[PDB]
Every structure is written in structure tokens, then in C-alpha cells.
Amino acid sequence: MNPPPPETSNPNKPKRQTNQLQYLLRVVLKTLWKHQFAWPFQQPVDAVKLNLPDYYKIIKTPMDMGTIKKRLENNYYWNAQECIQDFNTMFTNCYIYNKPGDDIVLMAEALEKLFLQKINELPT
Ligand SMILES: C[C@@H]1C(=O)N(C)c2ccc(N[C@H](C)c3ccccc3)cc2N1C1CC1
Numbered sequence: 573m574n575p576p577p578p579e580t581s582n583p584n585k586p587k588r589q590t591n592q593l594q595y596l597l598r599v600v601l602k603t604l605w606k607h608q609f610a611w612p613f614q615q616p617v618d619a620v621k622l623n624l625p626d627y628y629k630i631i632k633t634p635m636d637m638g639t640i641k642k643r644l645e646n647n648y649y650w651n652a653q654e655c656i657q658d659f660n661t662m663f664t665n666c667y668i669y670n671k672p673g674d675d676i677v678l679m680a681e682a683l684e685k686l687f688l689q690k691i692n693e694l695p696t
Contacts, residue, residue, distance in 0.1 A: 573619040575628050578635060580642035591695040592652035597644040600690045601637060607686065609679035613637045613662060630669050635662040652694060659687055 604610055615638045619627045628634065640658050642648075649655045666680040 573625050573628065574616075575634070577616045578639045580639060580648060581646050582648065585648070586650060587647040588650045589647050590651060593644065593647075593649055593655060595695050596652055596655050596691075597641070600687065601641055601644060603690060604683055604687060605637060605641070607683060609682050610637065612676060612679060613666075613683065627669060631665045633661055634665060635659075637662065652691075656691060663687075 605614065613636055616634060616636050617624065617627050617631070619625055635658050637659075640655065640662070643658070644655065663680050663684045666676060670677050
């Protein structure tokens with residue numbers, strides 16, 4: 573019921589290190605990670621463990637902060653926007669699979685606001 577997790581390395585994809593990508597790891601990801609609502613998002617959704625057999629029947633581009641963390645540590649991204657897109661996919665997946673007012677959605681909404689707060693101003 574679980575697909576393979578998203579890749580964290582890809583040898584035919586070019587790598588890059590930028591000040592904004594370093595910030596996304598040092599400040600943005602590592603701050604969100606310690607939030608009281610971060611724990612559902614620190615690893616790929618396990619549909620067998622969590623008893624959610626339809627999760628990947630609904631979510632076709634899964635993403636989580638553990639994957640993002642590993643991509644940042646491997647310089648997998650070309651630029652900050654690509655990483656920001658992964659965060660946005662993670663949040664949107666949560667809204668798609670659930671419904672408004674759900675506990676998990678309240679968590680994602682709070683994390684998304686803190687995320688936007690932190691990426692509002694990036695290094696040059
Ligand atoms: C799949 C969906 C989702 O989109 N994500 C990202 C996710 C990640 C970790 C968990 N673990 C427990 C079960 C939990 C249950 C309620 C409130 C917060 C956590 C649950 C979810 N939910 C499910 C609630 C329906």
C-alpha cells in the first residue's frame with residue numbers, strides 16, 4: 573500500500589548550493605522541525621502503520637519534511653523555489669487528503685503560516 577518514498581538523490585540532476593538554500597535548511601526547516609505540530613510531517617506517510625490504505629490512492633505527489641531535509645543536506649535542489657515548492661506540496665497534500673477543521677489540517681495550517689513567515693524575507 574506504500575509507494576517508494578520520493579527520491580533524495582538523483583545523479584543525472586544537477587546540484588547547486590545557494591545562500592537561500594542554506595537558509596532553508598539552517599533556519600526554515602530546522603525551526604519548523606521543532607514546532608509542536610511538526611511530528612506528523614517529519615517522515616513519509618506510512619499507510620500500513622497509520623492504517624490509511626487510501627492515502628496514496630488520493631495523494632499522487634507525496635512530500636514530507638524528512639524528504640525535504642534529506643534533499644537539502646544532499647544539495648539535491650537547484651534553487652530555493654524548488655525547495656519551497658516541496659513545502660507547498662506537503663501542505664497542499666494534507667488539505668487534499670483531509671477536510672477543513674481536522675486536527676491534522678489545523679496543524680498544517682499553523683506550520684504553513686510559520687513557513688510563510690520565515691520565507692517572507694530570504695538572504696540575497
Ligand atoms: C493522512 C493525514 C495526512 O495528510 N498527514 C500528513 C498525516 C501524518 C501523520 C498522522 N498520524 C496520526 C494518525 C494523526 C491523526 C490525527 C491528527 C494528527 C496526526 C496522520 C495524518 N493524516 C491523518 C489524520 C488523517
